[PDB]
């Protein structure tokens, strides 16, 4: 009685997924009622919904008198159940694609939408519903309730197409979006590195001016500071933040650096005239101005990049877990379908089924561990 294992496993995993998803959704609602709703939250919630659907349609029915058997109902119920399973699979595949596309948009081309839906998620759900229509034609109450397809290779065109549209194409698109996103993030990183280096050289040269005792060294340090300031001022913000012409920058960043360079020029004039002490006093005033103006902007810029990187890493983790969990299932199904050597079977499909459900029950934990507010809410 191997079912002792099989059914039992289904039970527990079902519980897991259900519980976890429920909890996460609850947290979201709280964060949507306390005034901290977020643009990404919608996506996450919808993904959770997809997971729930999978469970309610795939491991619960399969957690029946071994689903495919008698005592189900009329052909209509069987066809509807299979359609629900296929739409659940498509939604699980495509919600991650929608999340990755949203990340790409927010990282590359920053731009209505409701509080529980938006354009990309609705598009993914609609595509999932409309692409699973064939499941109604193929499946019926054939008699158990199985599906008979066209004898001329009904499999190499159905199962292969399912694998191509659910796993191959969405995963390839997600990989392309991920590599583009990481290129963009690495770009926004060397620019902040250049700004940090300019700040470091400015500080070091200011210290040198303080320690100096002759006009030559003071003037050389001032020249280094001036070049560094000019280079830094020409550092447009990355695409991950506000538009470059705006009050925060045009009024305080560029103007701050203009006043900086003016003070540097005045110190240089004093040094050229030959009054080193006046140059040192001007350098101290320069320190005061730079600390007042640019430190907060640099600190703020160092934080938004961190949040963007954290969310991108969360999305990458979700994608990696999803592929690791669903690849064996599609691989085995395609192997059986396309290959003529399909006959061999030791009934490993139960393990692939459980592994596929692992991703659905794991996604909420992935999200919780990557969001401080949500993790605190789960408390």
């Amino acid at each position, epitope marked *: 009685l191997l079912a002792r294992a099989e059914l039992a496993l289904l039970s527990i995993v079902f519980v897991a997924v259900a519980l976890s998803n429920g909890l996460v959704l609850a947290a979201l609602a709280r964060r949507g009622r306390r005034g901290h709703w977020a643009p990404i939250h919608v996506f996450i919630g919808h993904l959770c919904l997809a997971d729930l659907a999978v469970a309610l349609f795939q491991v619960l029915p399969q957690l029946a008198w071994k689903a495919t058997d008698r005592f189900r109902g009329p052909d209509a119920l069987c066809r509807a159940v299979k359609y629900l399973q296929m739409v659940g699979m498509y939604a699980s595949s495509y919600m991650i694609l929608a999340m990755t596309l949203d990340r790409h948009r927010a990282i590359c081309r920053p731009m209505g939408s409701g509080a529980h839906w938006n354009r990309p998620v609705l598009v993914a759900w609609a595509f999932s519903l409309l692409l699973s229509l064939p499941q109604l034609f193929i499946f019926a109450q054939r008699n158990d309730c199985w599906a008979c397809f066209a004898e001329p290779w009904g499999r190499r065109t159905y199962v292969t197409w399912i694998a191509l549209m659910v796993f191959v194409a969405p995963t390839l698109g997600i990989a392309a979006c991920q590599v583009l996103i990481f290129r963009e993030i690495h770009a926004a990183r060397r620019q902040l590195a250049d700004l940090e280096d300019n700040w470091e050289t400015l500080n070091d040269n200011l210290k040198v001016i303080e320690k100096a005792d002759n006009a030559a060294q003071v003037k050389d340090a001032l020249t280094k500071m*001036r070049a560094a300031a000019l*280079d830094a001022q*020409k550092a447009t913000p990355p695409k991950l933040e506000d538009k470059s012409p705006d009050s925060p920058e045009m009024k305080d960043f560029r103007h701050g650096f*203009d006043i900086l*360079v003016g003070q540097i*020029d005045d110190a*240089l004039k004093l040094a050229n005239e030959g009054k080193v002490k006046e140059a040192q006093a001007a350098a101290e005033q320069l320190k005061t101005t730079r600390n007042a103006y640019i430190q907060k902007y640099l600190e703020r810029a160092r934080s938004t990049l961190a949040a963007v990187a954290k969310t991108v890493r969360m999305t990458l983790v979700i994608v990696v877990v999803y592929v690791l969990c669903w690849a064996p299932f599609f691989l085995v199904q395609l192997w059986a379908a396309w290959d003529p050597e399909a006959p061999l079977e030791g009934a490993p499909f139960v393990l692939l089924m459980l592994l596929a459900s692992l991703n659905s029950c794991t996604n909420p934990w992935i999200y919780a561990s990557f969001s401080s507010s949500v993790s605190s809410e789960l408390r």
Partner: antibody
Amino acid sequence: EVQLVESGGGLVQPGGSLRLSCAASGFNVVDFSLHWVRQAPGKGLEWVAYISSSSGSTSYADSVKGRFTISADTSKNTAYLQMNSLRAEDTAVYYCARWGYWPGEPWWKAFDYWGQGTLVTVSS
Amino acid sequence: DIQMTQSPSSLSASVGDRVTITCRASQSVSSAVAWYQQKPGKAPKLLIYSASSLYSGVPSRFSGSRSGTDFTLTISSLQPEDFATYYCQQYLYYSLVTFGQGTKVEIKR
């Protein structure tokens, strides 16, 4: 509209004195710093001196420091360069260039309006 | 003192030939490099007023680019009037002006 004209060049002897002048038309000398750049016959350009009438700041090159003296007159709107203790290497064509002040674009447009240049020859 | 060196002492080219002139600075001047064109018996003429920004009245024929400390002036299509000497200036500060050696462009044969 904008024009710089130099005058005062000529032939002199080593150790003599000379007085180059540059007159600007179309703008105010106060709003721009005036630089003197010399080019030896057949050689590359070489910055010589500069003055800024707004603050009175002046600067000279090391090779000619302590000999030349650059001044300006806003009423007549003209810059002057008094050259003393000349030598053979001082022979060159002296152009006068205009360079805007720091804030904004006038600074990034470096020497955007030169003059025709005046020839100076040092020889016994 | 900041020293600017131009590798090409003299480039020979024919009409319609793209040409490039390179300059290197001792220190790092923050895109404070200008490119001038001088013809015999004439004062220089400001072609490029920054590392890359073109000046008014100059055809788009000329262009400039910067890479850290390398600076390059590129002419796409060479015209009969293009033939003339070219100078690279570093203007980080009023008292730190320093020109290059000069690159002479002349017809090919």
